[PDB]
Structure formats: structure tokens, C-alpha cells
Homo-oligomer: A and B are copies of this chain.
Amino acid sequence: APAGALAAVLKHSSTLPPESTQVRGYDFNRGVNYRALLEAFGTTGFQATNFGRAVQQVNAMIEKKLEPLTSCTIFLGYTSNLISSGIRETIRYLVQHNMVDVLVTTAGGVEEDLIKCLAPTYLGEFSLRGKELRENGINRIGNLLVPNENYCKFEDWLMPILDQMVMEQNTEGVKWTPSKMIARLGKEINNPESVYYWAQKNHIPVFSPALTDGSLGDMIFFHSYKNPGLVLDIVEDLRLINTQAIFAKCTGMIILGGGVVKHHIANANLMRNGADYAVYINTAQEFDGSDSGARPDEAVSWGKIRVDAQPVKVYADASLVFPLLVAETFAQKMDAFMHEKNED
């Protein structure tokens, strides 16, 4: 056998350092111990390991937070479609129990939470044809379906509130911004199944710079014809979110998906020289030079994440991962949260 070929393939190696963790997956011969099965992800490799790490990093934020400012200001960001999904329940739970501090989502993430209190979203298929669906008035979101009548009901619900908002603006001197509007819609919906009803109740601000990009915008638009004048200033909202990071004793970022939501939270944290913790769960890739697909390490170069931080990105659809992440972090600490509220 050729010497050079042998030497290249049979290259010797020393042993790995003692601290080295072995790849080992869950052993079903033990039966189904879910907690152990979930912890086993950490040593399974690839994204499972990243999920194992995410759990560890979210638990660090929490522990830190449990040490009105708190010991750690957690920013929760999520894309609109995630509110279209069942993750709406997951998010509402965190908000309901005051487990997070700031929320940021896109227009869809706001409106669809309120509309779900008016009518449901249904399961459909990615393959459903647009033409046939349009002829029936059915809007498709992935493999989900939103009957257009939901938006017609949304209008009936929203319009009178918009009458009042423009009224307050012009007589009571109210300066509306996306966050202020969202807090108002949340109080109006007055439904415990709503994320914004709880955010409003627990004084958790919700930022959404492009609140006009969706149904709410459609309604504001049509309403402006009979009632012009409504102003939504995004500048004051910039101030609000930014000072939230600046005056934080410590920060953690939990971001599902990318886009404006991901960037907005990271930019707020740049104001304090970087977030202390960061866990992302998104499907975007770096190859196209996009922000959405950028690895956390890129954020480090900008100063958005502390150089000493240990950000974690799980490359996966958050509809499958977020509830598992919550099961092993926030849901395990319920009693701990209640404790700080003097309820346990």
C-alpha cells in the first residue's frame, strides 16, 4: 500500500481533553422518561445539542432574573406567523405570568392575536391552491387557514376603538405610537386567551415599528377616510425600547424567527453594549448576507451581544421547538416566579 496514502488516512491523534463530552443519545430501554429524553438532546449532536444549550441559556436568564426593574430584562421577539400558529398559546402563557419583560412582534403578530378572540384559525395544507381559496374568501398562511370573514369581524370590532383613539388624540392630547396602540387593543379585547390582554395587564410593552403592515393597517387606512388625522409615531417607541435596554441591570434575548423583530431587539441591546444572554430559534441561513439568517457571532461584531456572552441559535421551526424549550425552562420555574410575586 502506498506509504503516502497510508500516512494521510492513518494519521495518529492524541486523546481529547478530559472535559470532553461524549456523543450519546437517549436509551429507550429505560422506557420513556421525558425529562431525561429532553436532557439527552444535549449530547445527541447537531441542533439537538443546540437545543440542549438553549435550555441551559434560557435557564440562566431566569435564574438571574429571579435574583419595575428585575435582575434581568428579558426581550421576547417573534414573527407574525408564529401568532397565526399555536405558539400564540405558548407566548400568552409567558406574558400572562409576567415571565418576560418586553415583547416585539410585527403587525401580524399583533392583529392575529386579537382576531383569534373573534374567530379561529384552521388547519389546512401548504398545497392548497390560491385561486380556489380566493374564490371562497379563504386566506392561506402556510398550512393554516384564516377565513376572510375573520377580518370583516375584526373591522366591526376595531372601528369604534379607532373612533375613540382619534378622538383622544385631538381632545385629550394623546400621542399615539405602536406600543400605546397595542396596549389599548389589549385592554379592549378583554379576553384571557389574548397575549396583549395580559401584556397590557402586566405592563409589558409591545413594540412593532411597522404596525401598518397588515389588517390593522388596512383598517386604519379605510378609517382615515371618514376620520383622518390618526398619527402613529415610531420615534417615541424607539426611545422606549432603547431605554429599556440602557437601564436594565442585565438582559436576555429570546427571539423566534428573524426580520425587524430580531434586529430591533438586538439594536436596543447595543445601547448597553450588548445583551448578556441570547437564544434564537430560526430557520434563516447566513449565505445570502441577510440579517435574519445571520449567526449570533455576527451580532457580537456589532456589539449587540456581549463578547463574554454565550449566544445559542437553534436552526429549527419554532412551532416544534419553542414549546419544548418552554417546558424545560419557564414551565419548570413557575413556583419560582410565583414566589417573587409573593404567591408561593
State which of B5, B108, B222, B332 has its C-beta within 8 Å of the C-beta of A6. B222
Expressed in whole angstroms, the minimum distance between the Cβ of A286 and any Cβ of chain B is 6
C-beta contact mask, A1-35 vs B, less than 8 Å → 1, else 0?
A: 11011111111111110001111111111011010
Q: How far is the CA of A319 from the CA of B47 in the complex (A)?
A: 7
Q: In the complex the two chains form, is A46's CB within 8 Å of B213's CB?
A: no
Whether B307 lies near A143 (C-beta < 8 A) is no
Residue among A15, A213, A294, A318 having the largest count of chain B Cβ atoms under 10 Å: A213
In the bound complex, do residue B142 and residue A45 qualify as a contact, i.e. CB atoms below 8 Å apart? yes
Segment from A67-75, A84-92, A182-190 that makes contact with B: A84-92
A167 proximal to B (CB < 8 A): no
Interface string of A191-205 (1 = CB under 8 A from B): 000000000000000
Which residues of chain B are within 8 angstroms of A14 by Cβ–Cβ distance? 136-137, 147, 149
Q: Max chain B CB contacts within 10 Å: which of A23, A217, A235, A294?
A: A23
Query: Is A299's beta carbon under 8 Å from chain B?
Result: yes
Residues 298-317 of A, flagged 1 when their CB comes within 8 A of B and 0 if not, give: 11111101010000000111
CA distance A138 to B300 in the complex (A): 10
Interface size of A by CB at 8 A reads 156
- Inside 8 A of A326's CB, which chain B residues have their CB? 28
Least CB separation from A247: chain B residue:
B2
Q: A21-B122, A26-B323, A260-B210 are in contact. Are A290 and B136 (CB under 8 A)?
A: no
- Whether A81 and B9, one on each chain, are in contact in the complex, defined by CB atoms closer than 8 angstroms, is no
Residue of B nearest to A122 (CB): B20
With A246-B4, A272-B5, A285-B285: A138-B13 Cβ-Cβ less than 8 Å: yes
Query: How far is A213 from B237 in the complex, measured between Cα atoms in Å?
Result: 11
The smallest C-beta distance from A311 to any residue of chain B, in angstroms, reads: 9
CB–CB B47/A288 < 8 A? yes
With A23-B84, A46-B319, A86-B25 already in contact, the answer to whether A267 and B214 are too (CB < 8 A) is yes
* A2: chain B residues within 8 A (beta carbon): 246, 271
Given contacts A28-B90, A84-B23, A285-B285, whether A10 and B151 have CB atoms under 8 Å apart is yes
Q: How far is the CA of A96 from the CA of B326 in the complex (A)?
A: 33
Across the interface, which residues of B come within 8 angstroms of A230, CB to CB? 235
A218 close to B (CB within 8 Å): yes
A316 to chain B, nearest CB (A): 6
A289 touches B24 (CB 8 A): no
Q: Determine if B48 and A317 form an interchain contact, defined as CB atoms under 8 angstroms apart.
A: yes
Instruction: Kindly list chain B residues whose C-beta atoms are within 8 Å of the C-beta of A136.
Output: 13-14
Taking A12-B148, A46-B319 as known contacts, 11 extra A-B pairs with beta carbons closer than 8 A to each other, sorted by chain A number, are A9-B270, A9-B271, A10-B148, A24-B86, A37-B327, A46-B85, A48-B86, A129-B297, A134-B300, A209-B211, A213-B263
17 A-B interface contacts by CB (under 8 A): A1-B221, A4-B273, A9-B303, A12-B137, A23-B86, A25-B90, A28-B93, A43-B86, A45-B319, A46-B317, A48-B323, A129-B301, A134-B303, A143-B289, A210-B234, A218-B267, A221-B242
